[PDB]
Design a protein around this ligand. Sequence first.
Ligand SMILES: *CC[C@H]1/C(=C/c2[nH]c(/C=C3N=C(/C=C4\NC(=O)C(CC)=C4C)C(C)=C\3CCC(=O)O)c(CCC(=O)O)c2C)NC(=O)[C@@H]1C
Ligand SMILES: *CC[C@H]1/C(=C/c2[nH]c(/C=C3N=C(/C=C4\NC(=O)C(CC)=C4C)C(C)=C\3CCC(=O)O)c(CCC(=O)O)c2C)NC(=O)[C@@H]1C
Ligand SMILES: *CC[C@H]1/C(=C/c2[nH]c(/C=C3N=C(/C=C4\NC(=O)C(CC)=C4C)C(C)=C\3CCC(=O)O)c(CCC(=O)O)c2C)NC(=O)[C@@H]1C
Ligand SMILES: *C[C@@H](*)[C@H]1/C(=C/c2[nH]c(/C=C3N=C(/C=C4\NC(=O)C(CC)=C4C)C(C)=C\3CCC(=O)O)c(CCC(=O)O)c2C)NC(=O)[C@@H]1C
Ligand SMILES: *[C@@H](C)[C@H]1/C(=C/C2=NC(=C\c3[nH]c(C[C@H]4NC(=O)C(C=C)=C4C)c(C)c3CCC(=O)O)/C(CCC(=O)O)=C2C)NC(=O)[C@@H]1C
Ligand SMILES: *[C@@H](C)[C@H]1/C(=C/C2=NC(=C\c3[nH]c(C[C@H]4NC(=O)C(C=C)=C4C)c(C)c3CCC(=O)O)/C(CCC(=O)O)=C2C)NC(=O)[C@@H]1C
Ligand SMILES: *[C@@H](C)[C@H]1/C(=C/C2=NC(=C\c3[nH]c(C[C@H]4NC(=O)C(C=C)=C4C)c(C)c3CCC(=O)O)/C(CCC(=O)O)=C2C)NC(=O)[C@@H]1C
Ligand SMILES: *[C@H](C)[C@H]1/C(=C/C2=NC(=C\c3[nH]c(C[C@H]4NC(=O)C(C=C)=C4C)c(C)c3CCC(=O)O)/C(CCC(=O)O)=C2C)NC(=O)[C@@H]1C
Ligand SMILES: *[C@H](C)[C@H]1/C(=C/C2=NC(=C\c3[nH]c(C[C@H]4NC(=O)C(C=C)=C4C)c(C)c3CCC(=O)O)/C(CCC(=O)O)=C2C)NC(=O)[C@@H]1C
Ligand SMILES: *[C@H](C)[C@H]1/C(=C/c2[nH]c(/C=C3N=C(/C=C4\NC(=O)C(CC)=C4C)C(C)=C\3CCC(=O)O)c(CCC(=O)O)c2C)NC(=O)[C@@H]1C
Ligand SMILES: C=CC1=C(C)[C@@H](Cc2[nH]c(/C=C3N=C(/C=C4\NC(=O)[C@H](C)[C@H]4CC)C(C)=C\3CCC(=O)O)c(CCC(=O)O)c2C)NC1=O
Ligand SMILES: C=CC1=C(C)[C@@H](Cc2[nH]c(/C=C3N=C(/C=C4\NC(=O)[C@H](C)[C@H]4CC)C(C)=C\3CCC(=O)O)c(CCC(=O)O)c2C)NC1=O
Ligand SMILES: C=CC1=C(C)[C@@H](Cc2[nH]c(/C=C3N=C(/C=C4\NC(=O)[C@H](C)[C@H]4CC)C(C)=C\3CCC(=O)O)c(CCC(=O)O)c2C)NC1=O
Ligand SMILES: C=CC1=C(C)[C@@H](Cc2[nH]c(/C=C3N=C(/C=C4\NC(=O)[C@H](C)[C@H]4CC)C(C)=C\3CCC(=O)O)c(CCC(=O)O)c2C)NC1=O
Lengths: 162, 57, 324, 177, 177, 172, 172, 172
Amino acid sequence: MKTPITEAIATADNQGRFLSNTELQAVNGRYQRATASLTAAKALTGSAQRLITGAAQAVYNKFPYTTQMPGPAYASSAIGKAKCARDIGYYLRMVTYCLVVGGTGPMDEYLVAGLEEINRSFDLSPSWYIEALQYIKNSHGLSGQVANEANAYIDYAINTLS
Amino acid sequence: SIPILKYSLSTQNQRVESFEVNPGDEQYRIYSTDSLPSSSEVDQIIWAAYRQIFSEH
Amino acid sequence: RLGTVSGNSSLDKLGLDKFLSESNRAYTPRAQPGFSSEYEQIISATYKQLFGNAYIMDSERAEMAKQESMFRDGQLTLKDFCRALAKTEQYKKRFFDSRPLYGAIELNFKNILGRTPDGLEHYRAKSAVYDTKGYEAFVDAFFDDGEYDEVYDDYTVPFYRGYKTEANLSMAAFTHFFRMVRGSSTSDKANPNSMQKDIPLNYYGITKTPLAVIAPGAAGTAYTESFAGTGSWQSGRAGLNAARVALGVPATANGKSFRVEVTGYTQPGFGITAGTAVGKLYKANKLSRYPRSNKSYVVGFDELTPLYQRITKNGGTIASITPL
Amino acid sequence: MLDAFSRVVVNSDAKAAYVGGSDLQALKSFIADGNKRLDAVNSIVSNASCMVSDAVSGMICENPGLISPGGNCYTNRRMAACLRDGEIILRYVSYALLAGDASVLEDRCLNGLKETYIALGVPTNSSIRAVSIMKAQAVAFITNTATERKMSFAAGDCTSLASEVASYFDRVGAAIS
Amino acid sequence: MLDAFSRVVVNSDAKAAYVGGSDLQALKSFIADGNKRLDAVNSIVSNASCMVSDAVSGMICENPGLISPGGNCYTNRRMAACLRDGEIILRYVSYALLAGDASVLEDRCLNGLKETYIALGVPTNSSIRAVSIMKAQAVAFITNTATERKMSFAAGDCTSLASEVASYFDRVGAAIS
Amino acid sequence: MLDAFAKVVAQADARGEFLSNTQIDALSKMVKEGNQRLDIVNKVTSNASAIVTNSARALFAEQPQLIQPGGNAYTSRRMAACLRDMEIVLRYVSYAMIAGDSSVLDDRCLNGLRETYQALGTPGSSVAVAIQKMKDASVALANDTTGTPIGDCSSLVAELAGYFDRAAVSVV
Amino acid sequence: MLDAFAKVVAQADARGEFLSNTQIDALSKMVKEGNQRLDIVNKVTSNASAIVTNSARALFAEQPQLIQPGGNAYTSRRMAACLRDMEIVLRYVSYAMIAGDSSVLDDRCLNGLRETYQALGTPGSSVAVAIQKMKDASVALANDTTGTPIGDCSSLVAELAGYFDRAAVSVV
Amino acid sequence: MLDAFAKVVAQADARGEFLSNTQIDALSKMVKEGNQRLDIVNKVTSNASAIVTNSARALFAEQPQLIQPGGNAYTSRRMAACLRDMEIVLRYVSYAMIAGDSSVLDDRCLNGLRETYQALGTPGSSVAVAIQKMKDASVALANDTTGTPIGDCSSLVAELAGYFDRAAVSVV
Ligand SMILES: *CC[C@H]1/C(=C/c2[nH]c(/C=C3N=C(/C=C4\NC(=O)C(CC)=C4C)C(C)=C\3CCC(=O)O)c(CCC(=O)O)c2C)NC(=O)[C@@H]1C
Ligand SMILES: *CC[C@H]1/C(=C/c2[nH]c(/C=C3N=C(/C=C4\NC(=O)C(CC)=C4C)C(C)=C\3CCC(=O)O)c(CCC(=O)O)c2C)NC(=O)[C@@H]1C
Ligand SMILES: *CC[C@H]1/C(=C/c2[nH]c(/C=C3N=C(/C=C4\NC(=O)C(CC)=C4C)C(C)=C\3CCC(=O)O)c(CCC(=O)O)c2C)NC(=O)[C@@H]1C
Ligand SMILES: *C[C@@H](*)[C@H]1/C(=C/c2[nH]c(/C=C3N=C(/C=C4\NC(=O)C(CC)=C4C)C(C)=C\3CCC(=O)O)c(CCC(=O)O)c2C)NC(=O)[C@@H]1C
Ligand SMILES: *[C@@H](C)[C@H]1/C(=C/C2=NC(=C\c3[nH]c(C[C@H]4NC(=O)C(C=C)=C4C)c(C)c3CCC(=O)O)/C(CCC(=O)O)=C2C)NC(=O)[C@@H]1C
Ligand SMILES: *[C@@H](C)[C@H]1/C(=C/C2=NC(=C\c3[nH]c(C[C@H]4NC(=O)C(C=C)=C4C)c(C)c3CCC(=O)O)/C(CCC(=O)O)=C2C)NC(=O)[C@@H]1C
Ligand SMILES: *[C@@H](C)[C@H]1/C(=C/C2=NC(=C\c3[nH]c(C[C@H]4NC(=O)C(C=C)=C4C)c(C)c3CCC(=O)O)/C(CCC(=O)O)=C2C)NC(=O)[C@@H]1C
Ligand SMILES: *[C@H](C)[C@H]1/C(=C/C2=NC(=C\c3[nH]c(C[C@H]4NC(=O)C(C=C)=C4C)c(C)c3CCC(=O)O)/C(CCC(=O)O)=C2C)NC(=O)[C@@H]1C
Ligand SMILES: *[C@H](C)[C@H]1/C(=C/C2=NC(=C\c3[nH]c(C[C@H]4NC(=O)C(C=C)=C4C)c(C)c3CCC(=O)O)/C(CCC(=O)O)=C2C)NC(=O)[C@@H]1C
Ligand SMILES: *[C@H](C)[C@H]1/C(=C/c2[nH]c(/C=C3N=C(/C=C4\NC(=O)C(CC)=C4C)C(C)=C\3CCC(=O)O)c(CCC(=O)O)c2C)NC(=O)[C@@H]1C
Ligand SMILES: C=CC1=C(C)[C@@H](Cc2[nH]c(/C=C3N=C(/C=C4\NC(=O)[C@H](C)[C@H]4CC)C(C)=C\3CCC(=O)O)c(CCC(=O)O)c2C)NC1=O
Ligand SMILES: C=CC1=C(C)[C@@H](Cc2[nH]c(/C=C3N=C(/C=C4\NC(=O)[C@H](C)[C@H]4CC)C(C)=C\3CCC(=O)O)c(CCC(=O)O)c2C)NC1=O
Ligand SMILES: C=CC1=C(C)[C@@H](Cc2[nH]c(/C=C3N=C(/C=C4\NC(=O)[C@H](C)[C@H]4CC)C(C)=C\3CCC(=O)O)c(CCC(=O)O)c2C)NC1=O
Ligand SMILES: C=CC1=C(C)[C@@H](Cc2[nH]c(/C=C3N=C(/C=C4\NC(=O)[C@H](C)[C@H]4CC)C(C)=C\3CCC(=O)O)c(CCC(=O)O)c2C)NC1=O
């Protein structure tokens, strides 16, 4: 788990160093943006069921074959649609964990590592999840620097699927 | 049973010492398995082994 | 002294000479009056046997000055006499209250029964009595069972028995038994694997895993590796213990694999020139070369030769070598 | 300890199903072949004194360095123990075949006899040469092709059963290995 | 348990040696001046607890901060265990003198005393500083060189056995070196 | 290696739900006391050897068998290696002070450190005294009001005393 | 590794004992079935990703507690490491199909596999029920009469079952 | 490692004083054998192949178990494993004889030899005869003054044979 605090510890531990004024501004700058990032995590938490089901329908409007084609990898059934809504809820949960810790720690560990082994095995396309995340990027309805923190960790997830 | 051909050394940077106590910025990041890493931090060692022995390609 | 076939005897040099010389049985149905050097030898035998060679002084023996006298007519030995010694403050100061519940259970088997319980279904039957019916039936859960009414008839003294095939415990209970018995110069407290504040076999007694049975008093028997489980479900770490399995392509690449057990290194010893490098003697991050000692390795048969060199040119002593 | 009848229950437990007709078809054919296995193990345990005779007097003619003064079967306690150490391990596989499961062999003896034996000092390659000398000693008896004693069975072919006691005794030898 | 009468019979059974009278002359030298061992044992076991009376008192006069806060013989409980700690090992020295081997101090005492004194933090330098004090304290009753006391002896050279206690005192600091 | 923020995240993911509203203001409490925590480790890194040599000279004056000829920490190759262990645990508690938890502290220092002190034959009760000799000196400068505005920093130095107490337990 | 020819070398090897004539006509029976061995390993490894993903899919259907959050196979790191070990047994069983004995399957893959799983905490009864899906998806794959002229392998399909039940009893 | 000059300095530092003058002329007896140690090395380092051929000539004769089919040293690497192990028990004794103690003998060869033979199954019975077949083979080989003058060397014949029996008891 990389945080700003568990990264400046690690460069202090590389040099045998007591925590100098170099490593006391890397952890101070997390505190001047933990205000704006924890309101964005609180806002995305409350509007989760609007954003999950709205993005699951915006996938199905762009890619209509996924609701039509038979076989278990598609959203053409009841349980096929339930597992797609589970997956965007897994994706949106790791965005809010990154706004708590201030970096891409929890989606590196719990989401990204080992993801391409799944998407090739179970025949799931990575462009089904760009369209789900590009909905959430410009339909969360945030503004200012609260939107700047949520839009940083959303397109980190787009770049590890692209 | 045929020892190696006795070559000669030269002048290099690694066979002297640096006098660098508390080294600042260009440290090349000792990834190690005695620091007891987590399962997301074993993964930052395995990438450093692949980058060292292979290239980044 | 070390020896297996040295004088045809395998376990007298393992540390069980006086636990196999004596039998400690009493010969009269009541203790006769007049002579006080024939039955006080039985009491100070049991004061080291039941307490595990712990120091009972006379300042606490006279605190317990009733419970041996009622044995001399009125109690039986081994069934009632050390049962009365197990209900004391001196028994509750060492094996009940400085330590957890399982550590109080798993030291009581060495004290009372002379064995090690295997798995957790033997820990299930003993700890179903403490949480329901107190401490006095917890101690007397042992004394009225088939495990106690068969091995000793009621006028011997309870010995150690956790090494024989008639004591049908397990094969792993052998391997725990020399973690618990380190010669005849230890105790519950003067034991490095657990002091009075700790618990002896937390993982290994539960999961029935066997261990390296090290002969005590050997060269470099000052070793025990610590515990951290690995994996990401249980959120553990990596780098503390070598594995107990040795599977894969490096299983049978170098032949048959082995598990070595190094006692410990220092800073003088790494160079091949018999000294210390005079300088800053460290790196910049100020750790050792082996930054914690008592480490272990997994190695095949075709690299046992340079690894046995590389331990022994560096100051590391070897506990044992077990194949995997 | 596991049974083969118990083996389909924990198969049906984390699956959280009931018992169907599908996995039931293995066990109902196990019933009618039960007497054939019952005609096997009675001759394993009744010629067991010969199988522990040829366990230890056979392995000692192919390495006599243990009866030498200084060996690991020299004294008459270790002579007595090697007669005794082999007559328990075929008693355990007689239990193991009636359940059918090797886990009763594993938890009772085959978890940790290897870690004792290098502290008891005995060699393991001598042991597996004494394990495998009971292996072909066993599989003659189940088929009735033994030379000097021929016993009463019925007529058939228990070579599925005769592989199973050969499927035990290698894991007897691999445990010491 | 070994002694010098039976040290040879665990030596000669590597040879399977029926003992003709060449090697037995050291045992006939052991029965020759074993009275000087016997006249030293009564010069030890009657003067036994005054060896340990100045052992830790001789230790604490030059190593003073073990009765300090953060010591090892601070309390009455911390000190009286140490006086039985030294009197156990000198009881186990003189078992080996009348036996004739180095058996009893290894197969009971130093089959695990190195891990004992590092489980408690017993300082190994001060737990050989007293035993080096108890080295030369234990030679003077054999020598009759003492400033304070004379034992009724016969006058010969026991210097073969006056350093044999020091040749037991070396391998008590084998593991706790 | 976890943080205080990453410990409450990792408990949420193993339950499989978002962070509650009671957990965000529990962390919004933790960020407004950040400049108190930055002022604590600025006090015990600006005196990061004046703590240590004054804790060594306190202990060596108290316990004299360390410096005795024949001692454990007698010679000058076992004196800097005594001052190495006194300086890395002041380093690694200060890493655990800035993290908010101590899972950096036990895995990078204290996992089996009393087992390596068992192998060297080191008296471990006196090094636990030396951590306690360092513990009160660390809170005497954390409570020092010079140069900072005055407020209440009560439970933060009881957290800092708990990190030294966790270090001093598992070294004996 | 050992195959069937390497058996009777080391089974006579340890007496010097040469090769007797009554054994090798059973071994020249095995080369009559040498062409019915290599089709059959080609039947397994051509479908080597359709036996894995069709049986992990039928594993999580009946056991939803492994893919639920807080389960063993929950995250994408531990889903990929569940499909890794489901294919590892498919390699070392088919290695034992081509060789003639078990002794590369239970020496490189099954020697401590359940005690790997007791240390990690995976349900060792549940890996056996995924393997027994792969047993039924491969024995019923290796009885097709397309691609080969129909031949009775009935003797050679019991050997393919007999290593799939050897991994079914290794992991519990 | 430490040597015979080092232990009377190891008891001059761990005791803690200066030198006694009885500790100085005890080292005169070390150079009363000091030239007489040096030609004793010539009776064992010039006959390195000569002892280890003449001993293993004898050792399989009265003990024919090692050359049996199913014996220990059967393959030629195992028979070469005997010759690399017969000499090092004499090589580190030859390191111990120039040293004057057994510190480097215990450091690099002996500690880790009883259990290493027991894990491999090579017997502790017959690795002591490889001490004993070279024990009498160097009592004769070093007791002759061919090149050096004649006097008393009745000490050091009870020191190199004071090291073989140390290796004999440290392996059985
Ligand atoms: C009064 C000295 C003059 C001077 C010296 C100077 N030298 C260097 C740097 C290096 N010198 C070497 C040479 C060797 N290194 C070795 O290990 C060996 C043994 C094989 C040799 C022969 C090397 C490799 C360096 C560079 C690495 C290093 O820093 O050690 C420097 C440092 C230059 C800098 O700015 O860092 C100095 C100052 N220079 C003068 O001005 C004096 C006249
Ligand atoms: C004043 C302190 C007490 C004391 C300390 C002491 N320690 C050692 C030696 C070691 N300690 C360790 C353990 C670690 N070293 C590390 O770098 C780390 C971080 C990863 C740990 C957990 C190790 C490995 C050694 C040996 C190597 C080394 O020198 O660092 C010593 C030296 C003992 C010796 O025999 O060399 C001392 C003196 N001892 C005391 O008396 C004080 C109470
Ligand atoms: C013929 C003598 C007896 C004998 C010898 C034998 N030894 C081995 C194997 C090993 N011996 C060692 C020990 C050391 N190796 C070293 O390099 C050193 C010095 C640093 C020592 C003390 C080791 C590590 C091995 C294993 C690796 C190797 O083969 O070298 C073997 C082989 C065992 C096998 O079964 O293959 C033999 C046969 N064994 C006897 O029976 C003779 C009495
Ligand atoms: C259907 C999946 C089941 C499951 C799988 C699972 N396994 C692990 C972890 C390991 N498995 C092994 C075993 C092997 N690894 C190998 O490389 C080989 C062949 C050489 C074998 C036999 C090992 C060593 C591990 C730990 C290392 C690893 O692979 O990660 C895990 C945990 C993954 C983690 O990172 O913690 C899972 C989830 N478990 C289940 O619940 C399913 C039933
Ligand atoms: C009790 C006698 C049984 C019995 C047992 C069987 N033994 C079989 C083979 C066999 N027997 C020995 C022992 C004997 N022969 C020797 O050469 C030596 C000395 C080294 C001894 C003590 C050996 C070695 C073997 C071979 C096994 C091996 O080493 O692989 C055997 C199988 C042959 C057969 O009968 O078909 C059996 C059944 N025989 C009986 O019927 C009684 C009841
Ligand atoms: C009791 C009085 C015994 C007795 C015991 C003997 N003690 C002997 C030697 C000895 N004692 C000490 C400790 C003493 N010296 C000190 O400097 C201090 C205090 C700081 C004390 C308490 C030492 C150091 C030694 C010498 C040991 C050594 O050399 O390391 C001894 C040997 C000869 C002698 O001194 O008499 C004996 C016999 N003496 C007795 O006879 C009664 C019965
Ligand atoms: C309790 C441990 C202390 C104490 C702490 C307080 N410091 C307060 C404010 C403050 N501190 C700093 C310096 C610090 N902040 C940083 O970001 C960095 C490094 C980059 C350092 C060294 C600053 C700049 C400030 C003002 C703005 C801010 O809070 O960050 C403070 C608040 C004052 C108040 O209570 O009104 C407290 C309590 N004060 C004490 O007296 C004890 C010794
Ligand atoms: C005094 C000369 C030393 C010293 C002594 C201490 N010994 C302590 C405890 C202790 N010692 C033994 C071993 C002893 N008992 C035996 O049965 C045998 C062999 C037959 C021997 C050598 C044991 C078993 C124990 C623990 C007993 C118990 O406490 O129940 C000890 C610690 C007592 C405590 O922790 O309060 C000390 C201080 N230490 C020294 O520093 C001087 C030099
Ligand atoms: C003969 C084929 C072997 C062999 C036999 C020896 N076993 C010896 C001792 C021994 N064995 C066990 C395990 C035993 N208990 C059981 O419950 C089972 C079965 C599950 C077995 C095999 C134990 C616990 C002991 C020690 C007994 C004790 O200490 O009381 C032994 C030596 C006896 C001794 O050392 O006194 C021998 C000779 N060893 C061999 O060399 C061949 C291969
Ligand atoms: C939804 C947008 C589209 C879609 C989804 C779909 N997904 C699956 C199955 C799986 N998805 C995963 C993915 C993850 N698991 C994780 O733990 C994480 C990190 C938190 C991720 C990203 C996995 C492991 C599976 C398989 C197991 C399961 O049943 O969930 C399916 C089912 C496939 C099947 O074969 O049953 C579906 C249908 N597919 C669509 O059609 C949508 C466009
Ligand atoms: C009271 C004690 C007691 C027993 C001893 C067994 C006795 C027993 N054996 C078999 C019966 C049998 N047993 C065998 C077994 C064999 N035949 C061979 O050719 C091989 C040598 C050997 C093992 C492979 C066979 C082939 C049958 C006949 C098939 C059957 O009906 O089971 C049967 C069923 C038929 C019958 O009634 O005879 C019974 C009851 N059961 C008992 O209750
Ligand atoms: C049950 C108790 C009991 C005993 C202990 C022995 C007592 C005993 N000690 C010695 C005898 C002796 N003791 C010594 C010893 C010494 N003289 C010195 O001045 C030295 C300081 C010291 C040497 C260390 C010597 C030299 C002899 C005479 C030689 C001999 O041992 O026979 C003798 C032989 C003298 C004789 O024949 O009368 C006897 C019987 N016997 C017993 O019945
Ligand atoms: C490099 C890969 C490779 C292979 C896999 C085999 C494939 C193979 N099989 C057969 C030939 C055959 N193969 C089968 C096999 C089968 N029929 C069944 O019902 C089972 C499903 C299946 C066994 C697994 C049969 C029954 C024959 C014809 C009989 C015969 O071989 O004589 C032939 C024709 C030559 C011959 O008859 O031997 C070939 C080339 N050979 C190879 O070179
Ligand atoms: C520089 C390297 C070097 C050597 C190679 C040896 C060789 C050697 N030894 C001796 C000298 C000696 N060498 C011996 C040795 C022996 N006599 C015996 O009866 C034994 C059988 C045999 C041991 C194997 C003795 C006893 C002396 C002293 C002569 C004497 O006693 O008068 C001398 C004469 C100088 C001296 O006395 O030191 C030399 C050069 N010594 C060395 O310093």
